[PDB]
Design a protein around this ligand. Sequence first.
Ligand code: GXP
Ligand code: GXP
Ligand code: MG
Ligand code: MG
Ligand code: MG
Ligand code: MG
Lengths: 298, 298, 298, 298
Amino acid sequence: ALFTGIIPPVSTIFTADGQLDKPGTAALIDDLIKAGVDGLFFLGSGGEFSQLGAEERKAIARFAIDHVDRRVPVLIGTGGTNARETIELSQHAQQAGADGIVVINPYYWKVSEANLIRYFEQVADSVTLPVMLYNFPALTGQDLTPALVKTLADSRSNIIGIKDTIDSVAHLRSMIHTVKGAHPHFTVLCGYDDHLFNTLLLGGDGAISASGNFAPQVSVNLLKAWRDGDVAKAAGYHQTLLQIPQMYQLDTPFVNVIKEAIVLCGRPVSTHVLPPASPLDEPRKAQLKTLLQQLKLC
Amino acid sequence: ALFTGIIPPVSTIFTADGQLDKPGTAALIDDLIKAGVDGLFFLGSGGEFSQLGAEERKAIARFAIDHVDRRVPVLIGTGGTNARETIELSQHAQQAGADGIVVINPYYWKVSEANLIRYFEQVADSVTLPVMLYNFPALTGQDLTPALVKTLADSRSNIIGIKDTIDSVAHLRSMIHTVKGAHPHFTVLCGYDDHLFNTLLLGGDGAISASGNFAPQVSVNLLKAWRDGDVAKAAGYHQTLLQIPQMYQLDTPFVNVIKEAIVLCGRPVSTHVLPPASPLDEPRKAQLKTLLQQLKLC
Amino acid sequence: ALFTGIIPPVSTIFTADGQLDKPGTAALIDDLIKAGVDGLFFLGSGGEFSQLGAEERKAIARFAIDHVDRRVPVLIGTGGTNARETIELSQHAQQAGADGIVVINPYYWKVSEANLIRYFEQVADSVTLPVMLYNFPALTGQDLTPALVKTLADSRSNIIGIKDTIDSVAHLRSMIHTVKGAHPHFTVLCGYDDHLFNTLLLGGDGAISASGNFAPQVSVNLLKAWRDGDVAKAAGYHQTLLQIPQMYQLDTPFVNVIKEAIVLCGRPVSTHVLPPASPLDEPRKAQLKTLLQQLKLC
Amino acid sequence: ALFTGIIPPVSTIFTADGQLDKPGTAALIDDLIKAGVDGLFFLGSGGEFSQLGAEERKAIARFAIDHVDRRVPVLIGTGGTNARETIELSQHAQQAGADGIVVINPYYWKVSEANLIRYFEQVADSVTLPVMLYNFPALTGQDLTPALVKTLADSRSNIIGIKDTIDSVAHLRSMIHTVKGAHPHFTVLCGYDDHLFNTLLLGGDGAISASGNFAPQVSVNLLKAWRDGDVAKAAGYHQTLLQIPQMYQLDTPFVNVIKEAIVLCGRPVSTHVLPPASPLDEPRKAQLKTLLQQLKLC
Ligand SMILES: *[C@H](C[C@H](O)C=O)C(=O)O
Ligand SMILES: *[C@H](C[C@H](O)C=O)C(=O)O
Ligand SMILES: [Mg+2]
Ligand SMILES: [Mg+2]
Ligand SMILES: [Mg+2]
Ligand SMILES: [Mg+2]
C-alpha cells in the first residue's frame, strides 16, 4: 500500500506581495520532514491550488519536489475543472519528479457518472505515477461513493488510494469495506484530523489533514502508538485531534488559520493568503492562540 | 447531570397480529437491566413511536414503566407533529411514573425558530419531568443547532439534555462546547453506536443507540472501562461499535434488523414490525447473522 | 381524468379551544363552491392534518363531506407516518362518502423504495376509491420522482393522480411527460399558486393551492380563460398568482396567513391555528392586508 | 437598465484539437445577431469557461468582441476560483472592448459572507465596466440570495444586474422584489429557458438561456410579443420554451446537446466539447432530433 501514514497537505507560503515564498515554504517542509511525516502533499485545498494559475502551480510543484529532494514521498495536487490542464499538470508533476498525484473530481459541473469515470481513467492514463483520488463532497457537491471508487480501482491499476475528506464515520467505514475488500492494498486516508484514529481502527491507512502543518507530532505519534500496539496512547493523541478542528471555524476558507497556527507553534512565515481568502483578524488570531494553548500545542 | 451513560432505545415487541407483546417486551427489558444499562428509553425511533397511535403509545409507556418498576431511570418518547398530543403524552408519562421524556422537534413542517422555541417551552411547561431534546436531522429536516439548544437550556430549567443523532464529530463537539460550556451538567448523548467513544472523549455523557438492544454489554463495558481509566480497553469495545452500524444498511427503516439481532443474540422475541416497515427477508437475516458472528456477538 | 381543475386545500376553521368550527368551515366551503371550484380537498397540509389526532380527522372529514353534500367532488387527506392509521382513515373516508383520498409519503423515516411502493399499494388496495398521491419533498425529505409515480400508476389502476407541491418547472414537466405519457388520464395538479399556468401549458390538469381559500376566483377564472382559449386573459390572472406567494413568507407554518387572508378578503372566520403554529402578529397582519390591497384581492 | 432582453450564453465552437474555431463561432454569432438578440454573453457555463485556461479565455473573448464589432452589447464571463485571475480576465475584457463582465461566486470553497462581499467589491473596483453577477447554485453550492445581491447593489454602483440560474419562481420573484425594489434599474435575467415568461411577468428583464443558441427566435419573439402587448402570443412561444429543457437531460454536462441542436436547426458548426464533457452518442442525437422536430424547431 502506497502513501500510507501521515502526509500533510502542506501550506504554500507566499510573500506579502503574493509571490511564492521559497525560504518560508522550504523551512516548513524541513520542519515537517524532521517531525517524521510519511510524505508531503503539495497543492491540496489547504495548499491553495484553487486560487493559483496553472504556471504558478507548476513553479510551486517543481520547487517543492526539488526541495524535498526525495527525503519522503511527494504528492502533487493537479486537479480542477479544466481536464486538459489536469493532464498537463499531472504530466508536469511526473516530469518534475513527483512520486504521485492527487486528483479531485471536477467541481463546477457535476458530470455524469460515465464522464466522471472517463475523466479519472484519462488522467490515470496520462501518467505512470500512482494516482490518489480526492473526495471532498462539501466543496465538490459530488460524492465519490465507495462503489465508484472501487469501479475506478478495478479499471486502472495506478488508481491506488483516496483522501476521503468528509465528517462521516459511515463514509470511511464503507470506503474501507468496499474498496479495500476488493483491493487490500488500496490506501484510504481521511482528510480530517478528528477521523485519523477511527480511520486506523476501521482498517484504513492514515490522514492528510491540516494539523499536519502546525502540530504534526500529534498525528505522527498517534500513528506510531497505533503501530506499536499502544492503543491507549494513540487514544490520548486522538483526544487532542478531536479538539483541533474548532480552529477551522474561525474563517472560511481557513487557509489563513492554518498559516497563523504554523506561526504560533514556532515557525515564523509570512501568512499571506490568496484572494478570495483574506488575512485573519487579530481577535480571531488570539482565539486561535488560546485554542492552541489549551491543547498544549504552543 | 441526568440520564447519563448507556440508555438503550428499547425496541417495542409486537405479536404476529400486531399487538404489544408484553412477555417479549418484558424479557427484553429484564435482559437490558441485567446487562447493567443506566436507563431505558421507550418509544424512540427504534421503539416505533411514529408508527403507533397515541392510545397505543400510552398503553406501551404504562406497561413499560410498571414493568421496569423503578429499577433504572425510564424515559418516554412523547414527540411527533401534533403538539397537543405531545403535551397529552408527556403529562400521561409523568402521571404513569416516568422519570423523564424525550422530545423531537416537529418533523413535517419545519417551523420557524420562534415557533420551535415556543413549542419546546410549552412542552417543558406541561410537565415537571426532566426533558431531553432529540435531534435527528436526517429524518426531521431541521437541525437543533448547539446555539438553539443552549437558548432552550437557558429558557427552561427542566430542559436538561439531548440525544444528538447525527454522523458528525463536529456537531457533537460543538453541542458539548456550546451547551455544556454554559450548563456544565446538561447531558449530551450521541444517537449512534459508533460515536460513543468520541462522545466520551469530547466531554459528553453517553449514548442512546440501537445496539443497546442486542449487544448492551459492548457499550456498558466501554463506559465502565472509560470510567475506570482503562482507555485501551474502552478503545477495544469502540472497535466493535465502529463496525456494528453496517447492519443498519440492511433495510430502511431498520427496526426489523434490530429485532432480528435481538433474536440472533439469544433472546427469542416476535420480530413483527409495524407498517410501513416490513419483515426482514431471509437472505438479509443471514447477512445480519454473519456480521454478528464476525464481531463475536453471537 | 379525475379531480381536474381548481381544487382548494381547504382550511380547517377551529374555535379557540382547537375544536372544529362548523359554521365557519361550512361558510368557507359554501364560498368556494359558489366561486366555481371543481372540487374540495380536506385535511391537506393547509388543512392542518399533521396537527390533528385520528379521531379529530375523522370528525372533520365526516362533517365536510356531509356539508358539501355532493355539490362537488371531495378529497380527503389520509396520510401520516402510521400506516395502519392511514388505512383506517382512508376506509373511514370511503365510508363517510368521500370521492377520493390523498396520500403523502411517510415523512419521518424516508422508507426504502420497496417499502414505499408496498405502502402505497397497500393503501390503494384498502379502498375501492380513487387515490391521489401527494408529493411535498420540502417537508417530507423524500421526493416522489416521476419514475416512481409511473411505477405506482403502472401497479394500481386506482392510483390516478398526484398533487406535486414543488417550486420546480422541471419536476412538473417530467411528471407530466413520464406519467401522463404512460397514462394519459392520470391527473397532475401542482401544489403551488404560481405554477398553475405553467402546469396547464405543460399538459397538466390544474392546482391544489392555498390561494384557493381566499381568492378562488383568480384560479377559477384562469382555468375558464384557458379552457375557453383566451390565453391572454389566463396570463393576466397568472400575473396575480405569481405575486400571491409573497405572503406565505410572513410565517412558518403559514396556515395562519391563509386564514387571515380569508378574513381580509371578506369572510370572517375564526383564524385560530393548532400548535405548533401560532397567531400571526398585528404588524404582519397589516403587511398582509397591504399586499392583498396591492393585488386587488380586497 | 443595462443588458435587458434576450442575451444568449453563446456556445464556443472548437476544432477537434480543442482550439477556437473562428469561422464556426463567427457564423453562430452572426446567426444570433441576425435573429434580433439584444446582446451576447461569451464564456458563460454554456461557453465552457470552466474547461478553458486563462490565455485561452482571453483569446476567445478578444475574437468574439471583435467579431461582434459593436453590433450588440457584449458580456464576457470572467469568473472562476482564482480571484487574481478574475481581475486579470475582467481587466483584459475591458481593454478588449467588452460592454460588461459576468462574475459568478467562487465555486470551490464557498467563502464566508465577508469574503464574498469583499470579492465582488474588489472585482467591481477593478474595472470601470458594468458588472453582472451570476448565480448558479446547483453548480456553485452557494446561493446568491436576494438579500446578499441587494447588499452588493447597495455597495457598488457598477454591480448592475444578475443572471439568476435557478429553477425557482420564488427565487426570481424575491430577487426582483428585494433588489429591483431598492434599485429599479438593476437588471434581473433568468438563466433557464422555461422561466423567461414568468421573469417578464414578475417585473424582471429577460433571459440568458441555452436555447438562445439554436432557437433564438423563440425567445426574441416572445420578448417582442410581450413588449408589444400581445400576451397571448408571448404565452405561445412560452409553451415551446417550457418544453425545450427536456433535451438537456440527454447528458451532463449538456453543452454537447446544445451544439448538436445548433447543427440540427440548420447551422453546421463543429460540435466538439472540452473534457470532461464528451460527444453526444448517436442514439441520443436521434432523440434530440426527434424532440426538435416535435417542437417545430427544425
Ligand atoms: C486536504 C485536507 C482537507 O481537504 C481540509 O481542507 C487538503 O488538500 O487540504
Ligand atoms: C434513538 C437511537 C437512534 O435514533 C438510532 O437510530 C432512537 O430513538 O431509536
Ligand atoms: Mg488542508
Ligand atoms: Mg433506535
Ligand atoms: Mg396548502
Ligand atoms: Mg448555458
